[PDB]
Design a protein around this ligand. Structure first.
Ligand SMILES: C=C(C)[C@H]1CC[C@@]2(C)CCC[N@@H+](C)[C@@H]2C1
Ligand SMILES: C=C(C)[C@H]1CC[C@@]2(C)CCC[N@@H+](C)[C@@H]2C1
Ligand SMILES: [Mg+2]
Ligand SMILES: [Mg+2]
Ligand SMILES: [Mg+2]
Ligand SMILES: [Mg+2]
Ligand SMILES: [Mg+2]
Ligand SMILES: [Mg+2]
Ligand SMILES: [Mg+2]
Lengths: 304, 304
């Protein structure tokens, strides 16, 4: 479908090609793929490409960390579709003390030592900023198997939940880590509304492009893990239109959230509340929204 | 507010002007308007014009009946805004047996004898078709003061409620009455989906244009009777955008309903289920949709 006009200019990290080869190559060696078709599909998705589109102004020696984290969480996200909520929760909860470093990984299990080595290397580079990503990640991981996915949801309730399932906080903390962007608790508190608005944009844009994939998943995967949980289906139900019609309407709403983002940012400066770090932060949020769109509309993950 | 492209072409009844003078003249003579400013505002609204846009193919000697019914229901609709739900209910329930003709009107009370004389004359012209408007009107009347108006609603739940509050069913029965268009129970059951889709279009288009009037009413009139009940406010809540942003998204949504209307009619025709009566009926529904939009975007009722 044709995207409505956007004033957001998507940016990609300069080292995207080098880092993609580095991180793809890593997972191709360590991760247990079912077959050659899955290995090809993994590379075709371009998980480091979306990361570089998400954080184009990340520091050169930190971008690979973000690519590794997003890549493994992508792989797990698909893995959970074949599990019940109970099995999926146990799977995630196992990785949490390992992510903290409190528990050694079983080195015969790829997901365990990949997660462990990753978080160790991140704390080794920047202990303080790496630690601030932990809880936001665990927040996301626990939302993935929340029983609310099996409950009827309206648009408002969905977006409220999706802020965790889309991993808004983890993306924010990881962006700051990758850019070395440090913010006071006061600064963080100032941009709450901007965060909330950005979350809806990320969520719905993903919903729009990943619908066909998730519809197939709902028909073939686990009854619980593969459950269809998206704004596309919700708006289609609520407004009595096709999923395609819902996509077109939702895309216009996304552009309204872009307009709101700009107004909130301009208001932040007008109220004299904008700091140099905050200016870089809200600009970074814009890159996430536009980077998420560019990748979603081009990745084979959603088109095939 | 620029409306998205539409293929629906509006049509107005040829006798719109002379019928307007006849019907406006009647109400100016009988209705208890508080002052001259209110009388001028009443004429400026063009209640017979929107009726003639709703039913452009009504029979020449029946269009005035439709203009009278819509006019008196328009006037009551505004009246209810200064009442509580309880007062509004008692006001409406009083008119229901009078509409049936089971209870005689108090001739000293304009609304009572206007309602009585109207339905009596409509029954005299076409007894059967007039009776089939009764219950749909009563359903609309009771929805006007329903306490669900003051309780939390999502988009879907609102559209389901608004179908009664927008009087979709009475508008259909009135259209058939005015055109002398008789349909069998079987025939009406075949276009139920088309009716439901049409209702959402009428509702939201009205919501979009009448928002400024209703926002002001909610701030100035009775906190119950004048309560803000509109898709504009609801979508603005769910998506956390301005009312203006909600309008733009809702208008695109209206175009999807127009597209659905065309698909449903085309399928009805392809299945060989589109009788001559149904073809006129579904065309009549389109006139209601395009006619509602034309009047809404030009009437002084919403612009002043
Ligand atoms: C892989 C992640 C880090 C999470 C957060 C980021 C995303 C919402 C972006 C869209 C795709 N989903 C799978 C991921 C899931
Ligand atoms: C007053 C009526 C006859 C109903 C049916 C017709 C309308 C939907 C037209 C828009 C305004 N509303 C108030 C009315 C409500
Ligand atoms: Mg997923
Ligand atoms: Mg997921
Ligand atoms: Mg998705
Ligand atoms: Mg673009
Ligand atoms: Mg009203
Ligand atoms: Mg009303
Ligand atoms: Mg209105």
């Amino acid at each position: 479908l044709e995207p409505p006009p956007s004033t957001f200019q998507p940016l990609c990290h300069p080292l995207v090609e080098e880092v993609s080869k580095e991180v793809d190559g890593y997972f191709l060696q360590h991760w247990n793929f079912p077959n050659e078709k899955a290995r090809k599909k993994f590379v075709a998705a371009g998980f480091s490409r979306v990361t570089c589109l998400y954080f184009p102004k990340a520091l050169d020696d930190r971008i690979h960390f973000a690519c590794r984290l997003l890549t493994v969480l992508f792989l797990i996200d698909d893995l959970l579709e074949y599990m019940s909520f109970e099995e999926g929760s146990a799977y995630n909860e196992k990785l949490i003390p390992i992510s903290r470093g409190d528990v050694l990984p079983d080195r015969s299990i790829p997901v365990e030592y990949i997660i462990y080595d990753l978080w160790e290397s991140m704390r080794a580079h920047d202990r303080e900023m790496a630690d601030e990503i932990l809880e936001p990640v665990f927040l996301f991981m626990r939302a993935q198997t929340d029983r609310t996915r099996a409950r009827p949801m309206g648009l408002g309730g969905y977006l409220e939940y999706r802020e965790r399932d889309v991993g808004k906080e983890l993306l924010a903390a990881l962006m700051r880590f990758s850019m070395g962007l440090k913010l006071s608790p006061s600064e963080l508190q100032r941009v709450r509304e901007i965060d909330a608005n950005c979350s809806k944009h990320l969520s719905v844009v993903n919903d729009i492009y990943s619908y066909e994939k998730e519809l197939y998943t709902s028909k073939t995967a686990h009854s619980e893990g593969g459950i269809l949980c998206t704004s596309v289906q919700i708006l289609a139900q609520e407004a009595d239109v096709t999923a395609e019609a819902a996509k077109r309407v939702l895309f216009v709403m996304c552009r309204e959230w872009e307009l709101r983002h700009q107004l909130l940012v301009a208001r932040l400066s007008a109220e004299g509340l904008e700091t140099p770090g905050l200016a870089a932060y809200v600009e970074g949020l814009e890159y996430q929204m536009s980077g998420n769109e560019l990748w979603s509309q081009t990745t084979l993950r959603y088109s095939v």
